[PDB]
Amino acid sequence: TSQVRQNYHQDSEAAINRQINLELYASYVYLSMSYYFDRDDVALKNFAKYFLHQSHEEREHAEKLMKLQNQRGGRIFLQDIKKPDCDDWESGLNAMECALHLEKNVNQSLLELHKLATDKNDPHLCDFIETHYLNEQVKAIKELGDHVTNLRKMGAPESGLAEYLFDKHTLG
Amino acid sequence: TSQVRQNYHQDSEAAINRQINLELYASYVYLSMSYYFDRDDVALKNFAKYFLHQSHEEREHAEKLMKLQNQRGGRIFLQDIKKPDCDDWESGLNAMECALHLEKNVNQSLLELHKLATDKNDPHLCDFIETHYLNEQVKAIKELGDHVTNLRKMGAPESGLAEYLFDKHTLG
Amino acid sequence: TSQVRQNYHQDSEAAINRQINLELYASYVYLSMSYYFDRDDVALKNFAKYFLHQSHEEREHAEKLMKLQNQRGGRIFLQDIKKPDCDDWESGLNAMECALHLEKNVNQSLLELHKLATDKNDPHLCDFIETHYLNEQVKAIKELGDHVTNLRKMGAPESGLAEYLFDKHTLG
Amino acid sequence: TSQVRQNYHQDSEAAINRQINLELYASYVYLSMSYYFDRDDVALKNFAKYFLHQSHEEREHAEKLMKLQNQRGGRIFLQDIKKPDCDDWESGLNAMECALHLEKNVNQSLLELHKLATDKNDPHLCDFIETHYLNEQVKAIKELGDHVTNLRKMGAPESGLAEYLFDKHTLG
Ligand SMILES: [Ca+2]
Ligand SMILES: [Ca+2]
Ligand SMILES: [Ca+2]
Ligand SMILES: [Ca+2]
Ligand SMILES: [Cl-]
Ligand SMILES: [Cl-]
Ligand SMILES: [Cl-]
Ligand SMILES: [Cl-]
Ligand SMILES: [Cl-]
Ligand SMILES: [Cl-]
Ligand SMILES: [Cl-]
Ligand SMILES: [Cl-]
Ligand SMILES: [Cl-]
Ligand SMILES: [Cl-]
Ligand SMILES: [Cl-]
Ligand SMILES: [Cl-]
Ligand SMILES: [Cl-]
Ligand SMILES: [Cl-]
Ligand SMILES: [Cl-]
Ligand SMILES: [Cl-]
Ligand SMILES: [Cl-]
Ligand SMILES: [Cl-]
Ligand SMILES: [Cl-]
Ligand SMILES: [Cl-]
Ligand SMILES: [Cl-]
Ligand SMILES: [Cl-]
Ligand SMILES: [Cl-]
Ligand SMILES: [Cl-]
Ligand SMILES: [Cl-]
Ligand SMILES: [Cl-]
Ligand SMILES: [Cl-]
Ligand SMILES: [Cl-]
Ligand SMILES: [Cl-]
Ligand SMILES: [Cl-]
Ligand SMILES: [Cl-]
Ligand SMILES: [Cl-]
Ligand SMILES: [Cl-]
Ligand SMILES: [Cl-]
Ligand SMILES: [Cl-]
Ligand SMILES: [Cl-]
Ligand SMILES: [Cl-]
Ligand SMILES: [Cl-]
Ligand SMILES: [Cl-]
Ligand SMILES: [Cl-]
Ligand SMILES: [Cl-]
Ligand SMILES: [Mg+2]
Ligand SMILES: [Mg+2]
Ligand SMILES: [Mg+2]
Ligand SMILES: [Mg+2]
Ligand SMILES: [Mg+2]
Ligand SMILES: [Mg+2]
Ligand SMILES: [Mg+2]
Ligand SMILES: [Mg+2]
Ligand SMILES: [Mg+2]
Ligand SMILES: [Mg+2]
Ligand SMILES: [Pt+2]
Ligand SMILES: [Pt+2]
Ligand SMILES: [Pt+2]
Ligand SMILES: [Pt+2]
């Protein structure tokens, strides 16, 4: 047993390892989306920049969970990072809709994690999730919702002009 | 009787209290409009910013009238601030049209106030209204008229692209 | 249904709308108190400044709740802002006592809101209330208690000298 | 006839000369009050400073009216500046009450002047009075009312401590 471990349930330790994998997966999804918009037949550079930034932020999320695992005396257990569901993302609107779906899935996982930490009476872990993850997810979901709304109202995905101008004015 | 009161008719005092309520009501209308554009299914952030600024300016209008009431030795008398007429505002164009209607109503009230102050031979109150309120209203009405015109000519409310681009270029 | 809504109970949405109204009401109470101390027959300018600042902070509280409602995909629903219970506030001590009563009422409402968010297993909303509201209320109640104590010990409300000197030394 | 004179009634010219005398009289009253508080058996230096500043501001009021008389092509006509009604002012409270009475008398004269300018359809003179005099009088009367209120509530004129502390905190 770790000399630092205190009030840290084995189930919570396992759930944190699963969350680490999911954050790394989200980083990979955003990396894929980013370079889709870097293709010469898509060519929306601020979509590409926006999703690359999101990819780096997910890697930071994963690193913070790994730090937490060690802080609490759990042991990190890594699994394969699955490739994203799509190779081709269709349009800026469809990529934003996929990102919204991804972030709501990550939020569900975090809420299940919080439920477990509550059930195991682990207030440090509850506070860690609330401080570093839950409002970040709410802000990310709201931003992506805003983006989807604007792209739809502007006429995407049929209007390539709409995605071009959104790239310049909102993401630029 | 107030030791400072001089040439200040009871009718003028009452009219100033009514105007205080109307300025607070206009602040509330603009607050409601602002957060309509903050909804995830509307998502026009500079419309939201513009109307929040207008809301704060109406609260300043109300505060200046309360200051005036005390300066002249009248006594402030507050009433409920009614909720705005709408919960949902439809479109950026419709909100601008509502704001134009609101500002012309506030201007009519101020012109009736000035008529009363003229009838009661109160030149200090006439000058207060002319200095701090009447040209402010004329400028606000002209600005909102300009905004309505541009949104109509651009194709709003049917063109969501129009409202998006107006948000960026005129309100941004 | 809102595309962003996740784990946000209809009861919580309604409770947030009620809290928005209560924050706007508290802003109005403090606005009324402020201009009471601006009267020529009261004339305590730092009492007036103190309560005007408190009024603006309550409007910020309300705005943050409106932002939260939209962040979570709820829909804002406004009601009339009732006029405060008093027109005349009697003395600096009595106004401070009224403010203490108001802030403890607002705190009770926030604690009921937190109880509901706990019952609906909404950790994001619990954390929002704890981060932005609960300690703010505890600090405000403690400050107002301190102020009431000092005014009583100095001899208020009978000693107009006491309220004058408190205006200069504590609020100045 | 003056080569510049236009729309300037002989009655208005005479009324402006009377107002010049009244402004010079108010300057003299405040000069007398100032040096009352400089006496070794009164010895309130910030009362003395406050009334000396008021005296200089009244001389500026008079100079501006003399400038106006020449601007409009009227001819200045001076009369004796009467000595103030009192040699001894009793107390800081009594001097403030006298100043309040003086400023309300000056305001009545200005309102009669404005009534005359209105009757003679002289909008330049109306605007001059409203811009440079009427709100200045309202602010001065409100300030003096505030001061009287505070001195009374603190226990003046019986409390020499009250006048001492008002001298330091409000006028200092
Ligand atoms: Ca596979
Ligand atoms: Ca109603
Ligand atoms: Ca009522
Ligand atoms: Ca004589
Ligand atoms: Cl343990
Ligand atoms: Cl343990
Ligand atoms: Cl365990
Ligand atoms: Cl594991
Ligand atoms: Cl996983
Ligand atoms: Cl694996
Ligand atoms: Cl967070
Ligand atoms: Cl947000
Ligand atoms: Cl936030
Ligand atoms: Cl469409
Ligand atoms: Cl009168
Ligand atoms: Cl009157
Ligand atoms: Cl009357
Ligand atoms: Cl009234
Ligand atoms: Cl009204
Ligand atoms: Cl009412
Ligand atoms: Cl104006
Ligand atoms: Cl203009
Ligand atoms: Cl202008
Ligand atoms: Cl059209
Ligand atoms: Cl859900
Ligand atoms: Cl939900
Ligand atoms: Cl529900
Ligand atoms: Cl509701
Ligand atoms: Cl409520
Ligand atoms: Cl209602
Ligand atoms: Cl807090
Ligand atoms: Cl504290
Ligand atoms: Cl604290
Ligand atoms: Cl007592
Ligand atoms: Cl002291
Ligand atoms: Cl002429
Ligand atoms: Cl002439
Ligand atoms: Cl003539
Ligand atoms: Cl003459
Ligand atoms: Cl005279
Ligand atoms: Cl003479
Ligand atoms: Cl003025
Ligand atoms: Cl004032
Ligand atoms: Cl003013
Ligand atoms: Cl007394
Ligand atoms: Mg992110
Ligand atoms: Mg993440
Ligand atoms: Mg405005
Ligand atoms: Mg206004
Ligand atoms: Mg506060
Ligand atoms: Mg509050
Ligand atoms: Mg908790
Ligand atoms: Mg002066
Ligand atoms: Mg003068
Ligand atoms: Mg006029
Ligand atoms: Pt997808
Ligand atoms: Pt409307
Ligand atoms: Pt009360
Ligand atoms: Pt006198």
Which method was it determined by? X-ray
Taking a C-beta distance cutoff of 8 angstroms, is the pair D38, D45 a contact? Answer: yes
Q: What is the CATH number of domain D1-172?
A: 1.20.1260.10
* CA atoms of A30 and D156, how far apart (whole Å): 75
Two tokens at D53?
A: 């500043």
Crossing angle of the two packed helices B92-119 and B45-71, in degrees rounded to 10 = 10
Crossing angle of the two packed helices B92-119 and B10-37, in degrees rounded to 10 = 170
Two tokens at A102?
A: 């991804």
Q: Cβ–Cβ contacts within 10 Å for residue B80, how many? A: 14
Tokens 């600005």 identify what position?
B143
| Closest-CA residue to D154 (of D141, D172, D169, D140) | D169
Asked if residue D123 has a cis previous peptide bond (ω within 30° of 0), the answer is no
Reading phi first (left if > 0) and then psi (alpha if -120 to 50, else beta), residue A137 is in alpha
User: Which phi and psi angles does C81 have, rounded to 5°?
Assistant: -90, 110
* CA atoms of B147 and C48, how far apart (whole Å): 38
| Burial tier of A172 (Cβ tally within 10 Å: 0-12, 13-18, 19+) | exposed
CA of A98 to the centre of ligand 12 (A): 19
Chain B interface disruption, residue of D134, D139, D143, D152, most B CBs within 10 A: D134
Q: What residues form DSSP beta bridges with B81?
A: C81
Resolution in A: 1.8
Taking a C-beta distance cutoff of 8 angstroms, is the pair C116, C15 a contact? Answer: yes
| Burial tier of B170 (Cβ tally within 10 Å: 0-12, 13-18, 19+) | middle
* CA atoms of D139 and B73, how far apart (whole Å): 11
Helix, strand or coil for residue D2?
coil
Helix, strand or coil for residue C81?
strand
In B39-172, at which residue ranges do the beta strands (DSSP E only) sit?
none
The DSSP code for D83 is P
Counting Cα atoms < 13 Å in the Cβ hemisphere of B79 gives 13
| Burial tier of B44 (Cβ tally within 10 Å: 0-12, 13-18, 19+) | buried
Domain ranges of chain B: 1-172
Tokens 């005398």 identify what position?
D21
Taking a C-beta distance cutoff of 8 angstroms, is the pair B79, B37 a contact? Answer: no
The residue type of B104 is K
State which H helix or E strand residue A151 sits in. Answer: helix A135-154
Instruction: Say if D169 is an interface residue toward chain C (CB within 8 Å).
Output: yes
In angstroms, the Cα distances linking B133 to A99, B108, B129, D153, D162 are 49, 12, 5, 36, 41
Residue A117 C-alpha from the chain's centroid? 21
* CA atoms of A6 and B109, how far apart (whole Å): 69
- Measured at the CA of A32, the angle between CA A26 and CA A33, to 5 degrees, comes to 90
| Closest-CA residue to D144 (of B2, B75, B124, B4) | B4
Give the one of C35, C40, C77 whose C-beta lies nearest to B4's C-beta: C40
State which H helix or E strand residue D102 sits in. Answer: helix D92-119
CA of A15 to the centre of ligand 2 (A): 51
D140's CB contacts (< 8 A; 6+ apart) are D103
Taking a C-beta distance cutoff of 8 angstroms, is the pair C164, D153 a contact? Answer: yes
Taking a C-beta distance cutoff of 8 angstroms, is the pair B171, B47 a contact? Answer: yes
A162's CB contacts (< 8 A; 6+ apart) are A151, A154, A155, A156, B161
Residue B136 C-alpha from the chain's centroid? 10
Taking a C-beta distance cutoff of 8 angstroms, is the pair C47, C167 a contact? Answer: yes
* CA atoms of C140 and C135, how far apart (whole Å): 8
Q: Cβ–Cβ contacts within 10 Å for residue B43, how many? A: 25
Tokens 């006298």 identify what position?
D98
Nearest-Cα distance to chain B for A143, in Å, is 8
Q: What residues form DSSP beta bridges with C81?
A: B81
Residues of C in contact with B27 (CB under 8 A): none
* CA atoms of A164 and A91, how far apart (whole Å): 11
